[PDB]
Design a binder for these strands. Sequence first.
RNA 1: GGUCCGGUAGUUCAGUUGGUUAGAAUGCCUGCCUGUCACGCAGGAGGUCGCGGGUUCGAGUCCCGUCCGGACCGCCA
RNA 2: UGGUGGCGAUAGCGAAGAGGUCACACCCGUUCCCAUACCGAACACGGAAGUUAAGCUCUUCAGCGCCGAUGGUAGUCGGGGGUUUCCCCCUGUGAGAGUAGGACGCCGCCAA
RNA 3: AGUCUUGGAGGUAGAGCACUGAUUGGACUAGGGGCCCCUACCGGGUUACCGAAUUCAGUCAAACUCCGAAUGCCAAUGACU
RNA 4: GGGGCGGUCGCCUCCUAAAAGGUAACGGAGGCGCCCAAAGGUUCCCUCAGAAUGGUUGGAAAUCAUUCGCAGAGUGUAAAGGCACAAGGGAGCUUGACUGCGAGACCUACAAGUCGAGCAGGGACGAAAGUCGGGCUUAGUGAUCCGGUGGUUCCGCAUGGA
Lengths: 176, 135, 120, 48, 82
Amino acid sequence: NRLKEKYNKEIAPALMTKFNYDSVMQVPKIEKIVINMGVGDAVQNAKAIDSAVEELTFIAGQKPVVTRAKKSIAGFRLREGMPIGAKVTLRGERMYDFLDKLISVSLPRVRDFRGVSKKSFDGRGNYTLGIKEQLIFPEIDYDKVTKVRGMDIVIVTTANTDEEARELLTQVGMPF
Amino acid sequence: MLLPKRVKYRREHRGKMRGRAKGGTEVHFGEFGIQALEASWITNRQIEAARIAMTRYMKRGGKVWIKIFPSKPYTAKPLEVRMGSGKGAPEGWVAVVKPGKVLFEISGVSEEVAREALRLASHKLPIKTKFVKRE
Amino acid sequence: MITKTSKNAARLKRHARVRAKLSGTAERPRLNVFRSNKHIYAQIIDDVNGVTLASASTLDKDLNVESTGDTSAATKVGELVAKRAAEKGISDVVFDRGGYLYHGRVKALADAAREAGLKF
Amino acid sequence: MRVNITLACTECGERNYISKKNKRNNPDRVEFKKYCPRDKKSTLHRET
Amino acid sequence: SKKGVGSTKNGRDSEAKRLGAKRADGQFVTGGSILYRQRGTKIYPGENVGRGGDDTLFAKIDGTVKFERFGRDRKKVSVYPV
RNA sequence: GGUCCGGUAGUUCAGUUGGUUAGAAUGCCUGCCUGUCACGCAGGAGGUCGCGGGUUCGAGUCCCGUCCGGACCGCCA
RNA sequence: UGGUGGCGAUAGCGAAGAGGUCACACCCGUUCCCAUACCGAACACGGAAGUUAAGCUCUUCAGCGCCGAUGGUAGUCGGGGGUUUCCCCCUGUGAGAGUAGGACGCCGCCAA
RNA sequence: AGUCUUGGAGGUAGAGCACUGAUUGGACUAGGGGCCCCUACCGGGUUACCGAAUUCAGUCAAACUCCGAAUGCCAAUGACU
RNA sequence: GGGGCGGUCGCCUCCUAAAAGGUAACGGAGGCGCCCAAAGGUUCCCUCAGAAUGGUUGGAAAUCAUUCGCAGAGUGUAAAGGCACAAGGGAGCUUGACUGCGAGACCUACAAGUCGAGCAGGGACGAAAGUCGGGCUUAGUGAUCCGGUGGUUCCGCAUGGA
């Protein structure tokens, strides 16, 4: 919200001038911020996913969906039909409300921090985070936490190449 | 001794031979080649013997090309048995060679020695042959 | 950018799917709808000869409203196309949603046609 | 295993329909609604 | 003397069914007659010809039969009323 | 030449059926015991399943072929 | 220019370039209809801030894909021979992977 | 019933690689042998000594077919027998 | 391809099969004696396998995000035919996995086997059109006699019952 208004006011004009897009609305934009959860279950502990779901709901703004595994694999003893992982999508005002928490408090609150992954990009503007702890905002009832597994986080943009997204994330406020 | 490392079936019809070869009728990789002017079968032992008769004589002169593969197996019932009651086991691989097919080709070697060496090897094959060279 | 398929492109597949089952013959023509962002079109079509019979639209040259695309416009255009069928009266048609979902302005149009008396 | 079963009804004793079923999947006495001929309408058919 | 062999285990097969078209292009047909006893939708039905439960094609209205290409590769049967 | 069996720790046999776990004696190693050795007492490691191919989420344990041996038959003139 | 049909992709895929007052489409926000096995991108909902960027519509092209007889042949119906697992002659018949080239759209009906 | 004309289904001979397999060479490199050292090879330097994957060329198949006849077969039309 | 021994005996898929159908051999390859209350019916909505790149616990593969991707993936199972306008995948409702039938036609020595529009009675789905008389098509199954069980507006040996 705050960020978004700022996105309308300062970010889009600045980088539109910096790249010379003839059409203004061609400017890159964050499309979605999506969360994935994965629990080594195959089932290892049936309560693991049944805990991760309603901790991730607090972490995000709304309930996730339990991911239905695609195909069976005996390497992990993962039979097809035993649920693993959970997903929640975020967009609209919610994605900016989420990025707000992240950039302002979460990354600086990591057990240790330096500049985020230098070349985590995929190649076409998408970009991913691997954060190991659930310490995202400090008011989680953090004493509840038994397992320490953090989040897999993907930010998806309308960028067509890595350079523009790299530049955009700067004034969005991500360190590198 | 060219084994096909695998095959879809280990038994199939003997088939028939009619007309010229479908492809590979002229030299394509070597300076000179050898051609067969009637239809017949050709087996691992034949190609192996001819190959050795070629290369061991030619020594360091160059390289020899083989355009043949005995993908076809052929069966034979066990010795001393009444015929019938199931196709016999397979014990050899064979390559169909219609007339016009060029079998072997030589590269990087003088003309006369290739001529006489191909003549030498031809006696290993059971088939009337004709010397042939690239256009 | 993220490969977003055209909305009309997606709609065309559904429209072809539904069209596969039915079509409007002589004395049993087919109604049709376009649910454009800014306008709504209606058509009475005879498949076999490949020509329309009568049509109606929000942007027709009379009876306009500031809606021109909302449910009120759908009702008005529906009764309009009912009259446009009436003068060269057919009295029956096979409905064919334009690969849409029968809940909204399409329902308003269908209700208008029914109450006007085009027996589906 | 699949075992044969004949269908029965409470609206009227005369019932005729047959079917198959798995004991493991449906241990409970199953119900279907079907057209009885002699009652000349649809009714709820149990099994015997 | 003699020697023993066996275990062919191949002398079996299904009592094969008949598959083919039994109305000729231009033949007059009567309603309910069979046109093509395919196995799988080898040729789709056109106007006035149905599609049976076992992928069979039968004429709904008595008339004349006609075969014609469907699209690039596929075929289709039709019955044209006389 | 045919039919049937099997092939697992270094040795001998279970499991080999339970498709979803490799086990029991002996041997061997360390320690204790004895003046020393042998018994004996504590502990411990091992094979990853004759070979190759295939089905299956998963093969030791299912189906094929190849090697190995073992059982039976190989008769009428 | 939109809508909606028939035609074998000679209509496709690519590469470039033009358009938008109107039409279309992106867009704006979920207030109530409806919905996201999580969500107003999607479903629907009610507008019209700005944009031809994309879609869509037009101009160009043989890079790919597609279509394509002419004479050849291989095969082959029917006759006739031969030293006959296979070859050859005569009346026809006629392969396809190859080029001659066609093509980067043609026909409609309702609304401008 | 034969023949002439028209229309059909049908995937053989043939041909071919577009699919499924088999399969020969060139280019190329991932990955393996290749010893040295630093040494857990961290990596370099490592033979064409093998060598997957691609692309250029090339050869095969009753259970391969983007193709596909000749004949045979099923009918309609009329014409002669 | 003498008997004995070995093997086989019914059904389903393909090749052998000579471009209709049919066509044998102790010819060449596989499968069946089931399974599914949803893996059926209907309405509605999509779309795959594999690969590359970023992402931790987590690699060759778990679960994510982008791109490529005509079908390599799926279709209960064995092969073939056919299927991305779904016959593949998902959700809601539902039991037509109905009764009486059936113009015609296929296949056929007989016995049987197969499809079938269309009609009536009641439904299920959907606003409607309209679909539904079991699986996406082909196997998953046997005569008659005798006996068991349910309904019977049938007969029941002088008559009424049995």
